[PDB]
């Protein structure tokens, strides 16, 4: 499923992925850790640190600064275990709250971040963070759009229709942005 | 197959995401 590596990266940019600053928080150079789409096909633990810290920070702020206080940036190995045990438990809780909608989190996926098994966990993680923010930034009069999105529809015509509504909304709202900033 | 309706639901997700994100800022910007 190539689009899994695709939508992920797009969804990565959806959270506002800026490869520079998010590499700057770790105190390391970009040239030694490549970002983008073709970054987790092989074992790549640095890109793992970066994307996982950004993904955990985008969803939570205070508890994220708490559980990753004695870990990040995990430059050494004694403090690395702190990161690997603070992230695995959280991902296990998240997977248990959703269940079949998530791949079962295994600590072994964190010993070598790469291959399709890591990309699967990463895409479902990105989906979860998107959704739990569609749960908070969408209006109280529109929270159902979240659960309407959790409703796993199976027919293609309704999927077409839903995309259709959303894309006309997209066009109109981007047009209103121009009206507001210019007028 | 399912892979295409998942593509559709994902793109709907992204539309909804970015739209709400720019709405919450434009409402702030107009006031």
């Amino acid at each position: 499923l190539a689009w899994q590596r695709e939508h992920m990266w797009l969804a990565l940019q959806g959270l506002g992925f800026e490869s520079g600053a998010e590499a700057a928080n770790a105190g390391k150079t970009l040239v030694h850790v490549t970002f983008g789409v073709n970054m987790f096909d092989k074992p790549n633990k640095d890109a793992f640190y970066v994307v996982f810290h950004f993904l955990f920070g985008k969803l939570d702020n205070v508890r994220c600064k708490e559980v990753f206080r004695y870990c990040w940036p995990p430059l050494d190995k004694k403090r690395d275990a702190e990161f690997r045990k603070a992230c695995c438990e959280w991902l296990k809780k998240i997977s248990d709250e959703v269940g079949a909608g998530f791949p079962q989190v295994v600590a072994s996926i964190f010993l070598s971040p790469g291959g399709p098994k890591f990309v699967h966990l990463l895409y479902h993680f990105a989906r979860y963070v998107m959704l739990q923010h569609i749960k908070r930034d969408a209006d109280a009069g529109n929270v159902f759009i979240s659960e309407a999105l959790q409703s796993k529809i199976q027919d293609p015509q309704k999927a077409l229709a839903r995309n259709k509504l959303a894309r006309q909304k997209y066009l109109k709202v981007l047009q209103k942005e121009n009206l507001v900033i210019e007028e | 197959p399912e892979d295409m309706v998942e593509m559709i639901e994902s793109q709907t997700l992204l539309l909804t995401y970015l739209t709400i994100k720019m709405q919450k800022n434009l409402f702030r910007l107009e006031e």
């Binding site: 797009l10 999927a159 077409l160 894309r167 997209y170 981007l174 | -």
Partner: peptide, 19 residues
């Protein structure tokens, strides 16, 4: 469906590039 897909993703990536 692929046409709406393409228009979608293109508008997504290009609007993301707006400052």
């Amino acid at each position: 469906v692929v046409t709406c897909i393409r228009e979608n993703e293109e508008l997504l990536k290009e609007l993301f590039s707006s400052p």
